[PDB]
Amino acid sequence: NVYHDGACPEVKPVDNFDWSNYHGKWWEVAKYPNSVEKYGKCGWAEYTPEGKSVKVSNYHVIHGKEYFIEGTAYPVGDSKIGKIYHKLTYGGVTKENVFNVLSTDNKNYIIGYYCKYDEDKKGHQDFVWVLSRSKVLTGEAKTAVENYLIGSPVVDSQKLVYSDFSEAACKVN
Amino acid sequence: NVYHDGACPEVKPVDNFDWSNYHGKWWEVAKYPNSVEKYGKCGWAEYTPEGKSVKVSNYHVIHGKEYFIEGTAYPVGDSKIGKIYHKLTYGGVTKENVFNVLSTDNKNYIIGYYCKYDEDKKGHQDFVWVLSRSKVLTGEAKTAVENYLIGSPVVDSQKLVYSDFSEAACKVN
Amino acid sequence: NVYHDGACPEVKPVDNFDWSNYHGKWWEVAKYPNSVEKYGKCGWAEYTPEGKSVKVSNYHVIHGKEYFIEGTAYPVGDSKIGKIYHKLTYGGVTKENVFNVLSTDNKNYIIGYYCKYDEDKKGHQDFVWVLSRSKVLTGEAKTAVENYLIGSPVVDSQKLVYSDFSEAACKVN
Amino acid sequence: NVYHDGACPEVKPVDNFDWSNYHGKWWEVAKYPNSVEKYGKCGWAEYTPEGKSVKVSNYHVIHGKEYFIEGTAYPVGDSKIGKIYHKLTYGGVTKENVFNVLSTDNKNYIIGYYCKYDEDKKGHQDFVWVLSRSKVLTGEAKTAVENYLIGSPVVDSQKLVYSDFSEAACKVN
Numbered sequence A, B, C, D: 001n002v003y004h005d006g007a008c009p010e011v012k013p014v015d016n017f018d019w020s021n022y023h024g025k026w027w028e029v030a031k032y033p034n035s036v037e038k039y040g041k042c043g044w045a046e047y048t049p050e051g052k053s054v055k056v057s058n059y060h061v062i063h064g065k066e067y068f069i070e071g072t073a074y075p076v077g078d079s080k081i082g083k084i085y086h087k088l089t090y091g092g093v094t095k096e097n098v099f100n101v102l103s104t105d106n107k108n109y110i111i112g113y114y115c116k117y118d119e120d121k122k123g124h125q126d127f128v129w130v131l132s133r134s135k136v137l138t139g140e141a142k143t144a145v146e147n148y149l150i151g152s153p154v155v156d157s158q159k160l161v162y163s164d165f166s167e168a169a170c171k172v173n
């Protein structure tokens, strides 16, 4: 889990988000570690569209067993601004969590960020995911991701943990 | 927070621990991040000997405000072996958590490990602290710590975060 | 610069090195600092295969000006064994310096070590490079470089300095 | 060796320097590594007044053998201001090098800094020494050293290397 002092940074999302492409199975190729996804392997997100909204379900495997959450996702304002609410319930509190699409090709990959702010302690936790339609980044998508990561003012490439997509890791029994 | 798969690893504690030095104020010079201490600055532990035991108090400061837990510590067996129970209560459950002393000069520094196992997920969380009687490592202590870190089978120094002992950080109001 | 007392340590190279992949452009993702590359950013190596040998060109960029050296590398013995001579001239003097490939995937990354021994002062300087066909370590190659760095007796990951591959740093006129 | 891009930092020397006390024998308790002092142990300096100047002799010991340089030191202006010229020869070139006294008690210790700028590369090398009358810092002096290092804009405590004052380190054959 990646903590910092202070408020959530001012982040600039993509201005050209293609809401059409937001569907299907996205593999979580990397992330910053977090407590909810603790121990999880072979992670993915599954987006099923309903207009300018999507039904969300996020899965991962731990030792042969599948775990998931369901929720819904829709743009905060204009579909083209890469800022999307993901409405999930944690701890019996349901909140609209702003996912920011920092980088995308509207085809193969998403690099997105969520910041959880603590008012009482005046700090925040950073959550980052690299979601891809492929278990492995190749070619242009991989090239795009690298160049983003090298300039990124928000994402620390070192802190990224890359998911295991072994058949062993991915097995549900 | 540092997560790995599998049960808690077997570690070798120091076999020459001087329990009589185990008192006084020990600054948290560095640690693996964990959720209980998120956003805290200027941490320290204070061990107040009570013959057999020591009373434990662990502090930090967040934005002029002090937070703490109190507990009790005692050797798991032979006092010269670097296995010390720390009896703390979290979430209404009281546990005798084993703290392994991985390296120490028996005067200025102590490098310690606690492993938290998840029986359901067949994985564990690693907790590491570098404790020092001075806010900054100097002389032989600094060298000893450096060298241990570099050889350690358990501690990945690259996951250490060193504390903020600024005047401002430490200011309590 | 990383100095240690005593002779060069006995390192264990890879015994499955694939000479046939020793070509192309290998970004200097990290190194131990040394005097010759001081100030240089965006560094790379270029290995031009000439069959038995390779032509070596090592570059970096300092303030829009590009600096480099050229040499020749060829295996110290058996191709499969991860010891390569790098024949370079410094101080009007051509040596055949042994580069030890400590870890590799024979595809994306290479972790290498050269040790410069001072006979008169019975000390040595350590040279470590982390080389990759991409400017940012991603996926399995990232995991593999980390997990090596953690277990390595030779390399202290805390003495690594990661290169800057920003557009600005890589800008040459 | 500690290298940075850019011009030398603006540094604030002590304005209460006691030139009278800048005499006699000072151990080098710590430094930033540098190439001149490569492999050296048990190092010390000796200042021998000659009027408004002091004659300088800097020593260390490498495997029973003694190595040294001589030169002269005198103030840049007013002796109350801790910037001192240290006139030494290296590479057949004799230069006046500014040594800035960042912190001192004028009794036990001195923390000093020299910055070596590369005009060609537009970068600089940092040189930091922690001098003391005593081979081990203790008491108020230690505390003074610790405190300075907590807030120091220039000196990184982690980059200090602490000299070896073992009799074996100090033994001259």
Ligand SMILES: C=Cc1c(/C=c2\[nH]/c(=C\C3=NC(=O)C(CCC(=O)O)=C3C)c(C=C)c2C)[nH]c(/C=C2\NC(=O)C(CCC(=O)O)=C2C)c1C
Binding pocket: A026, A027, A028, A034, A036, A037, A040, A043, A044, A045, A058, A059, A060, A067, A068, A069, A086, A088, A090, A097, A098, A099, A112, A114, A116, A127, A129, A131
């Ligand atoms: C494919 C990416 C992805 C993902 C992403 C994700 N989560 C989000 C939201 C959050 N994730 C989090 O972990 C928290 C909780 C923060 C907190 O309150 O602790 C939030 C809000 C957002 C955008 C806001 C996104 C894109 N989340 C998961 C995984 C999961 N998230 C879960 O809640 C579970 C079930 C855990 C269990 O019941 O044991 C899984 C597997 C995956 C695999």
Ligand SMILES: C=Cc1c(/C=c2\[nH]/c(=C\C3=NC(=O)C(CCC(=O)O)=C3C)c(C=C)c2C)[nH]c(/C=C2\NC(=O)C(CCC(=O)O)=C2C)c1C
Binding pocket: B026, B027, B028, B034, B036, B037, B040, B043, B044, B045, B058, B059, B060, B067, B068, B069, B086, B088, B090, B097, B098, B099, B112, B113, B114, B116, B127, B129, B131
């Ligand atoms: C000086 C070192 C040190 C430390 C040490 C410490 N904690 C220990 C134990 C634990 N810490 C933890 O965070 C958990 C896991 C609790 C859980 O189950 O989530 C355990 C068992 C152990 C013994 C192994 C040790 C040495 N612990 C702290 C700090 C703290 N630990 C605390 O519980 C709090 C209270 C936070 C609050 O009330 O909001 C502080 C400040 C410091 C500053």
Ligand SMILES: C=Cc1c(/C=c2\[nH]/c(=C\C3=NC(=O)C(CCC(=O)O)=C3C)c(C=C)c2C)[nH]c(/C=C2\NC(=O)C(CCC(=O)O)=C2C)c1C
Binding pocket: C026, C027, C028, C034, C035, C036, C037, C040, C043, C044, C045, C058, C059, C060, C067, C068, C069, C086, C088, C090, C097, C098, C099, C112, C113, C114, C116, C129, C131
């Ligand atoms: C991508 C990795 C890499 C590299 C690698 C490298 N160098 C090596 C060799 C050495 N480097 C050194 O610095 C010395 C010691 C020279 C000495 O001081 O005697 C040697 C032998 C070896 C072989 C083990 C390897 C793999 N070397 C460089 C960079 C350079 N090496 C150079 O000599 C120069 C030109 C400096 C100038 O003209 O001002 C550059 C840019 C890069 C960027």
Ligand SMILES: C=Cc1c(/C=c2\[nH]/c(=C\C3=NC(=O)C(CCC(=O)O)=C3C)c(C=C)c2C)[nH]c(/C=C2\NC(=O)C(CCC(=O)O)=C2C)c1C
Binding pocket: D026, D027, D028, D034, D035, D036, D037, D040, D043, D044, D045, D058, D059, D060, D067, D068, D069, D086, D088, D090, D097, D098, D099, D112, D113, D114, D116, D127, D129
């Ligand atoms: C007690 C502290 C101290 C010290 C200090 C020192 N050096 C200074 C100067 C420099 N040191 C350096 O290494 C260089 C050389 C920069 C260059 O390489 O051009 C400079 C100018 C300055 C003031 C700026 C100070 C206070 N310098 C030494 C040690 C030495 N300095 C030496 O030149 C040698 C002889 C090396 C040999 O003959 O092989 C020793 C032992 C000690 C032990």
